[PDB]
Amino acid sequence: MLEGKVKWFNSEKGFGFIEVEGQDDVFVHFSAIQGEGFKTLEEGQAVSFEIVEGNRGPQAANVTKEA
């Protein structure tokens, strides 16, 4: 998985972008968030994820809150 950083996340709306080096920011939606509990992410937070690309373009998948 890649490892990146939550660039920003709009906790009300439920989406934002991940920063990963040598790629562009990756769009992230709450449904990609792994774990139990309210799905949300903080700016600055480190996460491990994959980028899954279909016909809608690239988005993050399997976001796990790393440290």
Three-state DSSP at 34 gives coil
Domain count, the chain: 1
Q: What is the DSSP letter of 25?
A: P
Locate 8 and state its tokens.
């920003």
Containing structural domain, residue 5 = 1-67
Obtained via which technique?
A: X-ray
CATH number reported for the structural domain that contains residue 60 in this entry: 2.40.50.140
| Strands annotated E in 1-67 | 2-10, 15-19, 26-29, 46-54, 57-65
β-bridge pairing 57-65 and 26-29:
unpaired
Quote the CA–CA distance of 21 and 11 in Å, as a whole number. 24
Strand order in the sheet with 46-54: 26-29, 15-19, 2-10, 46-54, 57-65
